[model samples]
Target: VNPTVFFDIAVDGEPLGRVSFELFADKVPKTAENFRALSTGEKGFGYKGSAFHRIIPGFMCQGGDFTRHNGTGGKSIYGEKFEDENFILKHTGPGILSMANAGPNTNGSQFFICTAKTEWLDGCHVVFGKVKEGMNIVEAMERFGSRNGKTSKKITIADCGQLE
Candidate 1:
C-alpha cells in the first residue's frame, strides 16, 4: 500500500488546512521514500519549516527546500542530489506531485504539487504522488500566487508527518 503523508500549512502566519498525499511508492519507490522520510524528519532534517516559495497560480505550488526555503537550495537523503527515478507517471491532472530539479538527474528535496494539467513537464520531471485530501487548501493557496512564481504572503509547511 502507498504511504500517506500530510502537511499542515500556514499562510502569513495564519493556519490553513492540511494537505495529504498518497505516494505512488509502487511505481516510484525511491522518489516516494524521499518525500515520506522528509515528512517524518527521521533523517535529522526535514520539511517542517520550509516555505512554498514558488507558487504559480493555475500551475503548481512548489516547496520542500528545507535548506534555503527558496527555490535555490535543497538536498536529498542520499546526497545533495539524485537521479530521476523514471518518467512512468504523467502530469495528466491537477494535484500531482513531482520532483523539482535544475536539470535531468538533479532531483533533490524540492517538489511541486500541480494545480492544473502540466503535460509539458511529463517527460522531464518524475511524478511520484498525488493529493489524497485537502485539495481545497491547494486552491486556497493559488489565490496568493502570481505569474512570476512568487507568493504574496508567506506560505509554510508548519508541520508534516507520515500517517498510519
Candidate 2:
C-alpha cells in the first residue's frame, strides 16, 4: 500500500519547507505503525518544537529522540527483537527512510533519511519509507549539521491527521 504523510518544517510560523514521505507498510509493518502513531499524535511523541538533532553529510539525517526536547538522550522503543536482514527493504539511496538501531531490538523512535547512497546500512536497520517530495529540504537542512558533522534542525509536526 502507498501511505503518504506530509511534513512542513518551519520556525516561528514561517514555512521553511514542505515534505511528503511514503511509507512501506508491506516491508516494515510494526515500524510503520510506530511512525504512524507519532505522526497522528496518537502517541504524542512527535509534536511541535521537535528538533532533528543528527545529520551526517553524504550519508543520512537522524532525529526522533524522545528524551531531550531538542533531540538528545533517548531510549529504545522496540520492545522485542526481530531480524529484518532478509527484509526486501534496503537503504539504497537518497530519500530512503529507515529506522535507527543501536543493537538487536534496540530500535525506538529514531529514524533517518538518506542524503546519499548508504548501502552499508542495509539489513542493520529497518527500512520503512522514503521522502517522495521536499528532498531538497532534507538537503538544505544538511547545512545546519552539528559540530560533529551532523545536521540538527528544529522541526515541528504541524497537525498530522488522517489523509482521508
Candidate 3:
C-alpha cells in the first residue's frame, strides 16, 4: 500500500491548512522512503520550518529545502543526493509530487507540487506522489507566487508528519 504524509502550511506565521500526499511507494520505493523519512524527521532533519522558496504561476510550487530554505540546500536521508528513480508516472496535471534537481542524479530533499499540466517535465523528474486532499490549500499557496517564482510572503511548512 502507498504511504500517506502531510504538511501543515503557513504564510507569515499564520496557518493556512494541511496538504496531504499519497506517496507511490510501490513504484518508487527508494524515493518515497526518502520523502517519508524526511517528513517524519527520522533522520534528525526534515521539512519542518522550511519555506516554499519558489512558486511560479501556471507552473509549480517548489519547496522541501529544510536546510537553506531557499531551494539551494537540502540533502537526502540516504546522503547528500540520490539518483532519480524510474519516471513511471507522468506529470499530467496539478498536484503531482516530483523531485526538484539541478540535473540528472541530483535528487535530494527538494520537491515540487505541480500547479498545471507540465508535459515538459515528464521523464525528467521522478513523479513519486500526488496530492490526496487539500488541493485548495495548494491553490491558495499558489496565489502568493510571483511571475519570477519568488514567494510574495514567506510560506512555511509549519509542521509535517506521516499519516497513520
Candidate 4:
C-alpha cells in the first residue's frame, strides 16, 4: 500500500493549493487506514467535496465532517465508529493530523490539522499524519480563521488520493 495521501483543496471553489499527508500507518495502523481509505474513497468512503467549516488560527483547522458539512456528522471508512486506541501518538507541533472524536472510541470522519503546536491535545487526538508540503495552504486557512472558528469562505476538498 502507498505510504502518503494528498488532498487537493480550494478556496470558495477556486483551486488554492494542496495539503500533503504523511500517514503514520506504522504507528497507528487502524486510524491511518481509516484516513487513507477516506481520502481515496476506498470501500466507498471519502472526504471529497467536504469543507473546512471551522478553524482556529495558530491552533488547528478542523474538517472532514462531509456528512453534515458543519462538523456535526461523519462515518469512518468502515461506515462506523472506530479508533486506534492502542497508539501513543501526540499532538506535538504544527501539521499534526488526527481523528476528531467526541469522546473515546468515537472517531468517525472528522479530523484536524494543527497549524500550531497544541500539547493539550496530546493523548486526546490520534496523530495519524503530518503535512509534508504546501503548508502555505494551511497558512491561508489560518488567515481565514476567526474567533468564532466558522468561516464564510469554504475550503473545499477538490480531490484526494494517494500521492503516487
Candidate 5:
C-alpha cells in the first residue's frame, strides 16, 4: 500500500511550504507505521522544534530524534526485527526516505532523506518512502554539512501539523 504523506516544515515560526511523500507500506511495513505514528501525532515522535542533527553532503540528512532538542540522546523506536536485507525497494535515488539503523533491527525514529543516488545503502536500511515534493529543501539541508564527520547542523521540524 502506497500512501501519500504530506510534510510541512518551517525554520522558526514561518511556513516553509509543503512536501509530499509516498509511503511504501508493502515494502517497509515497520518503517512506514513508525513514520505514520509520528506524523499523525499518534506517538508524539515528531513534536515541534525537533532538529535533524546529522547532515552529510552528497549523501543523506538524518533527524527525527524525540528525546533531545538536538539529536544526541534517544532510544530506538522499533517494533519488530527483520532479517530481509534483500528487500525489493532500493535506495538508488534522492528523496528516498529510509530508516537509519546502527545494525540489524536497531531502527528507531531516526531516518535519513537521501540527496544523491546511494547504492551502498540498499538492503542495509529500510526504504520506506520517497520525497514527492520539495527536493530543494532536502538539498538545502546538505549545506549544513556534518562536523567531525559525524556532527551535524540542526534542521528543526518547527511544526508537524495536518495537511490543509
Candidate 6:
C-alpha cells in the first residue's frame, strides 16, 4: 500500500512547484490514511489553506494545522484520537513525513517534513510518509522561516491536496 501523494506549495502567495510522497500504509495504515485523507481533502478538510505553523531551521517545518492556523489545533478524520504507529517507521533522515503528536497514541493530523535526519524522534512520532520530490521548495520553506507568530513568507502551504 505504498501510494504516492503530491503536494503543491506556495511562497508569498505564489507557486513553489510540487513535492511527492510515498505513504507507507502497509506498516502504518491508520496513520497513513489519516494523512492521506487530510492532505487530499477527503472530507472537506485539508492543508490547502494551512500555513507552515512552525519552522526550525535545522530540524523540521511543521504543518497541516488547518484549524488553528498554528500548531495548536489538529483532528483526525473520524474525530477521535488514535494510537501511535511508531514501530512501523523511524525518523531517520530529511524529508521523512511523521505525525506530530502530544504523546503516545495521541496522533491526530499534524505532521512535519524533516529538513535533517532526526534520530531523536524515533519511537516518539509515527513516520507515515516521506517527501519524494522538490526538496528545493522544502529548503525554501526552511529559509523562508516564519513571521511574527504567523506565516505568509515562503512558508505558506498555498496548496496541499494529494495525488495517488
lDDT of 3 by residue, 1-164 (tens): 89999999999999999999999999999999999999999889998889999999889999999878788999999999999889899998999999999999999999999999998998999999999999999999999999999888999999999998
Per-residue lDDT over 49-150 for candidate 6, one digit per residue giving the tens place of the 0 to 100 score: 777878877788888777787788888886856888557578888899998888888877788999999988888888888888888778877876653434
Clashing pairs in 4: none
Ranked by lDDT, the better of candidates 3 and 5 is 3
* Candidate 1 displacement at residue 61 in angstroms: 0.5
**TM values, all candidates:** 0.98, 0.81, 0.98, 0.94, 0.80, 0.90
Q: Where in model 6 is the C-alpha error above 4 Å?
A: 146-154
lDDT of every model, 2 decimals? 0.94, 0.68, 0.94, 0.84, 0.68, 0.79
* TM-score of candidate 3 relative to the true fold: 0.98
**Residue by residue across 51-82, what tens digits does model 1's lDDT show?**
99999998999998888878889999999999
Pairs of residues at least 3 apart in sequence or in different chains that clash in candidate 6: none
> Which portions of model 1 miss their true places by more than 4 Å?
none
Q: What lDDT does model 3 reach? A: 0.94
Position 164, candidate 4: lDDT: 74
Better of 1 and 4 by lDDT: 1
Q: How many clashing pairs in candidate 2?
A: 5
User: Which pairs, if any, clash in model 2?
Assistant: 55-150, 55-151, 77-108, 145-151, 146-150
39-157 per-residue lDDT for model 4 (tens digits):
89977767988888889887889999888888889998765688556648788788889888898878898999998888887777788888998888888877777888988688889
Residue lDDT tens for model 2, 55-101: 66777777767567444444433442334433478777899988777
